[PDB]
Amino acid sequence: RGPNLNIVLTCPECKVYPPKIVERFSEGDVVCALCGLVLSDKLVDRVGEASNPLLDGNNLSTRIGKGETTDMRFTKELNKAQGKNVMDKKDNEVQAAFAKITMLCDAAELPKIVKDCAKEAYKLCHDEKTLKGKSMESIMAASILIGCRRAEVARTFKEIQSLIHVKTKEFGKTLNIMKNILRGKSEDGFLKIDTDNMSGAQNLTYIPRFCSHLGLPMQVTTSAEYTAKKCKEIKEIAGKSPITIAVVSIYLNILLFQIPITAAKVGQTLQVTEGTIKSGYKILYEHRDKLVDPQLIANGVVSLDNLPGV
Amino acid sequence: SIAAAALQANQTDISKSHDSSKLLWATEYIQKKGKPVLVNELLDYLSMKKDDKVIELLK
Amino acid sequence: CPICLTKYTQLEAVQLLNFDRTEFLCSLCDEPLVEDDSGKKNKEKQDKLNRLMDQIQPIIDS
Amino acid sequence: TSGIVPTLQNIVATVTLGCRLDLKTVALHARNAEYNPKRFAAVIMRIREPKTTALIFASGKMVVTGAKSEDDSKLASRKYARIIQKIGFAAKFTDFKIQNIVGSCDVKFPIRLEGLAFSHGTFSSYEPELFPGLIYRMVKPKIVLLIFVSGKIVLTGAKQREEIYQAFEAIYPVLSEFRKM
Amino acid sequence: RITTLDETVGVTMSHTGMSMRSDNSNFLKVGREKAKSNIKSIRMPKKEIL
Amino acid sequence: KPMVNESDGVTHALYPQEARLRNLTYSSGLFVDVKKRTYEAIDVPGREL
Ligand SMILES: [Zn+2]
Ligand SMILES: [Zn+2]
């Protein structure tokens, strides 16, 4: 369908399809690897500005700024003229939304992959019929958390809602809408295997951040990581939230390595009720050999009797 | 038929202390009907029958 | 030519025939060309002129 | 096949009466009735021998919740219509439609829910920090399911018995394959 | 002299950006203290309204 | 003291050799003790606030 407009590099003497083609970049030729006949010479291997048409689309606009000799009134008139443009109103509002997303992620000092994934999620999830009535803050929070979960750098709900003053209702519904529409777009476009990237719990990623907020050593972080990994085997704690199971595993490993911090300080820092931590410690107190890392007690750095009684 | 008694007892009397509402309800009865109305049914609309200032204020 | 959506007049389609003498073949698409529906609408445009001219008759008379 | 048939616990239906109802009269005359005009623009009542709650609106539409089965909702609507007839209003069963049926069941084995969400991800959405139950939206029929690690499965959003029964029959082999400990 | 924090860096970054400690200060919480007032009313008869 | 935060929010003390190898920035955070004060007054004409 339509014009072909395609050039195939076929050797006219060997008549072998597909031909073995060698691109001699140093000598600037395209040659046939069988006979050595050249195919295209004078090949072309800065002057413009980079613009990827996947993050913001095929938007092509330039602003007006002060030069060497600049009158202020002309600049104000040109800025007002650029303001009253009706064709790029959708482009202007999605650029303002991108600026707000990158400012809000940048005040959160998250990496650039989070901002890129949030921007592309916002672009591919914009102008949808099923998502029109939700407030913009919920859209931004859902895009931010989707971008966090895309790059194995996933965050939690409480620290997202600490920055964006949004309720749990519309944030959860917007998250579900985003997940459904992104899976639909992936099925329509390039299909992607999940392989545990938007997993619901993802409690293995919340260990070192809370350990660093508590100022624990990295061996305690690895021990709590092993404990959180082995909590999947226990059926009595499977329904618990990832945050609470991470907190109780961290507290269990603190009591294992005799780190001199209190449960009240852990509850104050990590915003968890001490009753939940005590209940998790009590239900994990019976599971001793199923949580303590076997090479840690093989090395003798920890022992089972360091845990206080219940 | 206790609901009918409740609805007929919940509503207050139309005999107000000011003639303004007493002529306003006559004008409302005039407007709500698709045909012009006579004096007798207008007088039967409110609680009295004898002449007062309401008829001359309406005229 | 509907694949390339290209016009061809009677003067410029002379040099695009095959040796089979069967069908008009395009230079780019190499596609069997189809006949335009234009030209047969001559009477339709004449009727459009007739329907414009009698309605604009008060303008001419005035 | 399934070794246990799920049982229902709430059937929500609606009946239109084709009449105008005054909320204050039915709030005052009825015994077990509540009316908060500042909160909800309808009157609320309930009856004990089916243990069902009626949402009575001013337009004649009314909603029955808390019915275990269809006949319980039928007799609840019959007694509600008797209450409306005997309270001083005229009502008729112009249209009665059942619109929601829920049910609960148990499989009595733990289910690895993470593997379930990994395999059947296109119909399910998991967020344990908000709700510990997996929300599964199957496309045929339109039944939503709440999945728990204790084996308790809650089917919600049904209209009759065949759709919820075939939903459990379809969800049984994809859930019985997961075993923990 | 300026004061150098001699504690662990993670304790200082606990309050940074993403901090799931919720904000508790009542400074300029105008949106919270003026969204709590809601008006609700019904259709009382027209005569008293007039 | 100089430190670095990672992608996942983990902050550890940064040393110049590690900073040079990982293309990081040998920087230290700055904190300020901010104090907030809210004042209210009866606003009536003819009276100093
Ligand atoms: Zn060749
Ligand atoms: Zn063509």
Give the Å distance between the CA of A19 and the centre of ligand 1: 7
Domain A206-299 classification at class level:
mainly alpha
**Which residue has tokens 């002060």?**
A66
Burial of E25 (0-12, 13-18, 19+ CB in 10 A): exposed
Distances in whole angstroms, Cα of residue A7 to Cα of each of A4, A10, A39: 9, 9, 11
Given CB atoms, is D38 within the 8 Å cutoff of chain E?
yes
With left for phi above 0 and alpha for psi between -120 and 50, is residue A49 left, alpha or beta? beta
Q: Say if residue D179 is in the same domain as residue D106.
A: yes
What is the token pair recorded at A159? Answer: 């620290």
Give the whole-angstrom CA distance, residue D157 versus residue A157: 28
Q: Say if residue D8 is in the same domain as residue D31.
A: no
Q: Say if residue D93 is in the same domain as residue D111.
A: no
What stretch of H or E contains F21? helix F16-21
Q: Tell me if C26 sits within 8 A of C6, measured CB to CB.
A: yes
Give the whole-angstrom CA distance, residue A114 versus residue A112: 5
Measure E37 CA to nearest chain A CA, in Å: 18
The breaks in chain C (C to N more than 2.5 Å) occur after none
**Which residue has tokens 């009720």?**
A273
3-class secondary-structure state, position D52 = strand
H helices present in chain E, as ranges: 9-13, 30-34, 46-49
**Which residue has tokens 């001793």?**
A288
Domain that holds residue D28: 13-98
Q: Say if residue D25 is in the same domain as residue D93.
A: yes
Experimental method: cryo-EM
Calculate the CA dihedral of residues A221, A224, A229, A230 and round it to 10 degrees. Answer: 150
Give the whole-angstrom CA distance, residue A80 versus residue A23: 52
Q: Say if residue D93 is in the same domain as residue D77.
A: yes
Out of A156, A233, A238, the one facing D113 most closely (by C-beta) is A238
Given CB atoms, is F7 within the 8 Å cutoff of chain E?
no
What is the token pair recorded at A234? Answer: 């226990």
Binding-site residue numbers of A are: 11, 14, 32, 35
Give the whole-angstrom CA distance, residue B19 versus residue A32: 109
The sign of the CA dihedral F40, F42, F43, F46 is: negative
Neighbours of chain C (3+ CB pairs under 8 A): A
Binding-site residue numbers of A for Zn(2+) are: 11, 14, 32, 35
Tell me, what amino acid is at F39?
A: Y
| Cross-strand bridge partners of residue D144 | D137, D156
Q: Say if residue D75 is in the same domain as residue D130.
A: no
DSSP C17: B
Burial D136-157 (b: 16+ CB within 10 A, else e): bebeeeebbbbbbbbeebbbbb
Q: What angle do CA D111, A186, A110 make, to 5 degrees?
A: 80
DSSP D41: S
Give the whole-angstrom CA distance, residue D126 versus residue A203: 13
Q: What DSSP string describes B7-56?
A: HHHHSPPS--SSHHHHHHHHHHHHHHSSS---HHHHHHHSS--S--HHHH
What is the token pair recorded at D101? Answer: 């049926």
DSSP C25: B
What stretch of H or E contains D145? strand D143-147
Give the whole-angstrom CA distance, residue A283 versus residue A310: 10
Give the whole-angstrom CA distance, residue A165 versus residue A158: 11
Q: How many domains does chain D have?
A: 2
Q: Tell me if D124 sits within 8 A of D135, measured CB to CB.
A: yes
Phi/psi for B4 (5° steps) reads -65, -40
Domain boundary among D67, D98, D129: D98
3-class secondary-structure state, position C55 = helix
3-state secondary structure chain A: CCCCCCCCCCCCCCCCCCCCEEEECCCCEEEECCCCCEEEECCCCCCCCCCCCCCCCCCCCCCCCCCCCCCHHHHHHHHHHHHCCCCCHHHHHHHHHHHHHHHHHHCCCCCHHHHHHHHHHHHHCCCECCECCCCHHHHHHHHHHHHHHHCCCCCCCHHHHHHCCCCHHHHHHHHHHHHHHHHHHHHHCCCCCCCCCCCCCCCCCCHHHHHHHHCCCHHHHHHHHHHHHHCCCCCCCCCCCHHHHHHHHHHHHHHHHCCCCCHHHHHHHHCCCHHHHHHHHHHHHCCCCCCCCHHHHHCCCCCHHHCCCC
Q: Say if residue D132 is in the same domain as residue D155.
A: yes
List of chain F residues whose C-beta atoms are within 8 Å of the C-beta of residue E7: none
What is the token pair recorded at D160? Answer: 């009759």
What stretch of H or E contains D118? helix D113-119
**Which residue has tokens 């602003």?**
A63
Q: What angle do CA C39, C41, C46 make, to 5 degrees?
A: 115
